[PDB]
Amino acid sequence: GAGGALFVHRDTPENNPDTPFDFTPENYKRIEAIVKNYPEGHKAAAVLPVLDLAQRQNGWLPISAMNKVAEILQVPPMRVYEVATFYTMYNRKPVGKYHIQVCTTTPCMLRNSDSILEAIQKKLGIKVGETTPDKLFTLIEVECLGACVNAPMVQINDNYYEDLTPKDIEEIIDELKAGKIPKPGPRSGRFSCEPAGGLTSLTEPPKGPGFGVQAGL
Amino acid sequence: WSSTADPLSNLVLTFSTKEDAVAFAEKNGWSFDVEERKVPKPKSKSYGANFSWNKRTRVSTK
Amino acid sequence: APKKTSFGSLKDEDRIFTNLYGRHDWRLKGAQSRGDWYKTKEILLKGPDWILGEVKTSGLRGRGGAGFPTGLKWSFMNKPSDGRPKYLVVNADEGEPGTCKDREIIRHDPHKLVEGCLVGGRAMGARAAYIYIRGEFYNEASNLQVAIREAYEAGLIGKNACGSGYDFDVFVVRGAGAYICGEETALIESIEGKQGKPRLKPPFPADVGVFGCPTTVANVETVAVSPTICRRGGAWFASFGRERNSGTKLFNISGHVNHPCTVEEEMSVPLKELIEKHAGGVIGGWDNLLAVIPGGSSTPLIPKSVCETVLMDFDALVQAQTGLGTAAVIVMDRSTDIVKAIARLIEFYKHESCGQCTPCREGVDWMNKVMARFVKGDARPAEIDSLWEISKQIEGHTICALGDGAAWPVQGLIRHFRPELEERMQQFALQHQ
Ligand SMILES: NC(=O)C1=CN([C@@H]2O[C@H](COP(=O)(O)OP(=O)(O)OC[C@H]3O[C@@H](n4cnc5c(N)ncnc54)[C@H](O)[C@@H]3O)[C@@H](O)[C@H]2O)C=CC1
Ligand SMILES: Cc1cc2nc3c(=O)[nH]c(=O)nc-3n(C[C@H](O)[C@H](O)[C@H](O)COP(=O)(O)O)c2cc1C
Ligand code: SF4
Ligand code: FES
């Protein structure tokens, strides 16, 4: 569907250039390490990580954070604005403590991602773009998180929970709202992308070093 | 409305070359001013220069 | 008997990614116990020309989906330097729907990718490697960083890498949610801190790449098989698969199968053999199969009658009016709304377009609207042909191949399921009077 989000910023008391943002000293050391990964005279290559780091410190990206990154990297603020509005992982509005992202693309849809989405909506009482009144959960739909073999799956704060049933995701949400850490990964009793039927391959013990080496090497 | 009294206010003639126009003006007794043709100079366009390693031609946006 | 005529039944001894399922230690010690970082110094001391020759003899084609010959592509960097540094960029974006092969390589065999980075960078005379991984793969990227730290501490990379006297660095840069950033020039632009908009070619990356320097962008699976190819030789890799379709391949089988999974198999294995052997078969039997997308969302679908004898290589699937792509097999049984699935793929492409060039930016959204109407049946049959023409207008007129990847699935749906579209339109016209 058409994106309900806007790509023009209007100043707000909650979000304006005078909104207080600054990197912590530990984050400044991290920024130094990031900047040293690129050649001299090409500092702007650090825009994507440093900006992301600001989010990891702030939860989201107020416009003051973008201005701070632009000032730090000697980059015009409009370039940072372009980066922040191009990439979907950046949050330009505040989100809940647990950002739930449900993949609804065709491989996941064929495995009933609709049931997972409706289970989440009913368990939380919100919709696919809303935030809970306690600011604990935000729910959205995303495209192909790259675990189609383990469909249907959900990402919560750079963790993957896969092989999902409605009961599984309800239990995960219950564990999250109690402060626990649900273990990421599949929930079907299967560890990874392996076949559930009994490991149709890689059953033999892995060979040693130099087993197939050619002559002359 | 806008009113005029000179009958030649809308007279524009087209010529293939400057010499033809000069000859036509001369045989009609009109004093003339000739301005030479302005052609844009050829320019060096390089798309790759948008991404230069050490030059200022590097662009900051696309 | 030479010239194998049947392909498949790949053995465990011949498999390259031996820790695909993460049942063994993914750290440095486990990788070394499995054959990684073995005689890397001798491979680097053989010289770039020997390595490029091994890759050329191997017949390896680009595992990122396009299948460009890897040796030829890497040979473009064998030129003398002109004062700029040289770079290897490893593509770990993995944005294609139905494709999850790279993620397993990163999380369970990171040292394979690291040694491949070293070997490929030596072959291409590249000072360092930048690994670009999608930002959703946070744990995979952290595992990769741990493996890189282990290789740095053991002296395998860095200054005097492996004792070979060659200096090589490995950097990991994380993207932020963009499927277009898997396109190599868009990836290069993303690394430089810009919007992920692809560049026009020429210049090709080997001339002007990251930071304006000579660069080679190579898929992670392509990179991670090069050290094994060098060690076992080009010929061993060459024997597997048909001619010009050599080696092994990682397949991700998803959709309406009993055991969706990622497996390693010989190149030219028949699709039916793959599905029934490794994925457990089609849900409800083979006769329940409706359609298969064989190479990720960008390849056109093929109906059941074609999937029965088709082989899973570049040339055979090209002959089947589709592509090998990422070798991501999405299976749809007869209970699938075939129009709705393709409409969802078109919506994906609509949400992933970078918006730089007119045909993609406008026509993909136009096709998304038309397909959304086609799902309901709101349109008229004539519009079907109109839609086809729209796809042809988009295809070949765009800066990058995302336009091709949006036009092809629609063309496949129209080619093989036109009666379904007309039948749905008939129902809509009937019920709405
Ligand atoms: N692995 C994944 O997750 C995804 C894979 N893909 C696949 O990518 C394929 C299309 O990608 P493209 O890069 O546009 O195909 P391409 O044919 O234009 O390029 C393939 C590779 O060969 C190089 N190359 C091609 N022609 C060259 C030339 N004349 N000189 C020098 N180098 C040359 C290119 O630099 C590139 O690296 C698609 O078929 C798709 O299956 C698409 C999306 C995601
Ligand atoms: C829209 C688009 C997305 C792409 N995404 C990826 C990707 O995620 N991973 C990848 O390896 N190649 C991707 N490619 C293909 C690359 O542009 C390039 O051809 C490939 O990385 C070359 O590596 P190889 O020669 O080792 O296959 C994509 C291409 C396009 C047009
Ligand atoms: S085809 Fe689409 S993604 Fe590619 S450059 Fe054009 S608008 Fe951007
Ligand atoms: S379709 Fe859901 S992860 Fe790819």
User: Mapped to the 3 state alphabet, what secondary structure does chain B carry?
Assistant: CCCCCCCCCCCCCCCCCHHHHHHHHHHCCCCCCCCCCCCCCCCCCCCHHHHCCCCCCCCCCC
From the CA of C196, the nearest ligand is 3
3.40.50.170, 2.40.10.120, 3.10.20.600, 2.40.128.20: CATH of C248-333: 3.10.20.600
| C423 marked as part of a ligand binding site | no
Task: Output DSSP code: residue C25.
Answer: -
Query: Residue C340: which of C290, C390, C284 has the closest Cα?
Result: C290
- Spatial neighbors of C287 by CB under 8 A, at least 6 apart, are none
Query: Residue A34: which of C133, C173, C186 has the closest Cα?
Result: C173
Ligand 1 near C98 CB (within 6 A): no
Nearest-CA residue for atom 4 of ligand 4: A144
| Closest chain A residue to the Cα of C22, Cα to Cα | A192
CA A55 to centroid of ligand 1, rounded, Å? 33
A5 contacts chain C (CB < 8 A):
no
Question: String of b and e for A108-135 (b: at least 16 CB within 10 Å)?
Answer: bbbbebeebbebbeebbebeeeebbeee
The Cα C404–Cα C252 span in angstroms is 22
Residue C202, preceding bond cis, omega within 30 degrees? yes
SS3 C170: strand
From the CA of C326, the nearest ligand is 1
Chains A, B: CB contacts within 8 A come to 8
- Kindly list the residues from chain B whose CB atom is less than 8 angstroms away from the CB atom of residue A76: 60
Query: Residue A48: which of A20, A69, A68, A67 has the closest Cα?
Result: A69
Q: What are the structure tokens assigned to C283, written together?
A: 């849900």
Q: Which atom of ligand 2 is nearest to the CA of C400?
A: 31
The Cα A118–Cα A11 span in angstroms is 35
- Spatial neighbors of A46 by CB under 8 A, at least 6 apart, are A31, A34, A35, A37, A38, A73, C193
- Token pair 């806007």 is found at A6
Task: Output DSSP code: residue C334.
Answer: T
| A193 marked as part of a ligand binding site | no
Asked if A79 lies within 8 A of B54 by C-beta distance, the reply is: no
Tell me the angle at which helices C110-123 and C101-108 cross, rounded to the nearest 10 degrees.
100
Residue A160: strand pairing partners: A155
C-alpha distance across the termini of chain A, in Å: 57
Query: Residue B58: which of A207, C193, C138 has the closest Cα?
Result: C193
| Closest chain C residue to the Cα of B57, Cα to Cα | C212
Asked if A82 lies within 8 A of B54 by C-beta distance, the reply is: no
C-alpha pair distances (Å), C313 with each of A41, A208, C60, C240: 45, 30, 12, 11
C-alpha distance across the termini of chain C, in Å: 67
- Kindly list the residues from chain A whose CB atom is less than 8 angstroms away from the CB atom of residue B60: 44, 75-76, 79
| C96 marked as part of a ligand binding site | yes
- Kindly list the residues from chain B whose CB atom is less than 8 angstroms away from the CB atom of residue C189: 62
Q: What are the structure tokens assigned to C368, written together?
A: 């998304």
Radius of gyration from C-alpha coordinates of chain B: 24
Instruction: Name every residue in B having a CB less than 8 A away from some CB of C.
Output: 47-48, 50-54, 58, 60-62
- Spatial neighbors of A34 by CB under 8 A, at least 6 apart, are A46, A49, A50, A53
Q: What are the structure tokens assigned to C431, written together?
A: 């019920």
Burial category of A13 from C-beta neighbours within 10 Å (exposed 0-12, middle 13-18, buried 19 and up): exposed
Nearest by CB to C341, which of A106, A150, A159?
A106
A145 contacts chain C (CB < 8 A):
yes
Q: What are the structure tokens assigned to C134, written together?
A: 């999608």
The Cα C198–Cα A90 span in angstroms is 21
From the CA of C293, the nearest ligand is 1
Dmax (CA) for chain C in angstroms is: 80
The Cα A206–Cα A203 span in angstroms is 9
Contact C361, C390 (CB under 8 A): no
The Cα A67–Cα A70 span in angstroms is 5
CA–centroid distance for A27 within its chain? 20
- Spatial neighbors of C195 by CB under 8 A, at least 6 apart, are A82, A83, A86, B61, B62, C189, C354
Ligand 1 near C99 CB (within 6 A): yes
User: Mapped to the 3 state alphabet, what secondary structure does C335-353 carry?
Assistant: CCCHHHHHHHHHHHHHHHC
- Spatial neighbors of C299 by CB under 8 A, at least 6 apart, are C293, C317, C322, C323, C324, C325, C408, C409, C412
Helix, strand, coil content of chain A in percent (nearest 5): 35, 10, 55
Asked if C35 lies within 8 A of A107 by C-beta distance, the reply is: no
Is the CATH code 1.20.1440.230 the one for domain C338-432? yes
Residue A60 CB neighbour total at 10 angstroms: 15
| A1 marked as part of a ligand binding site | no
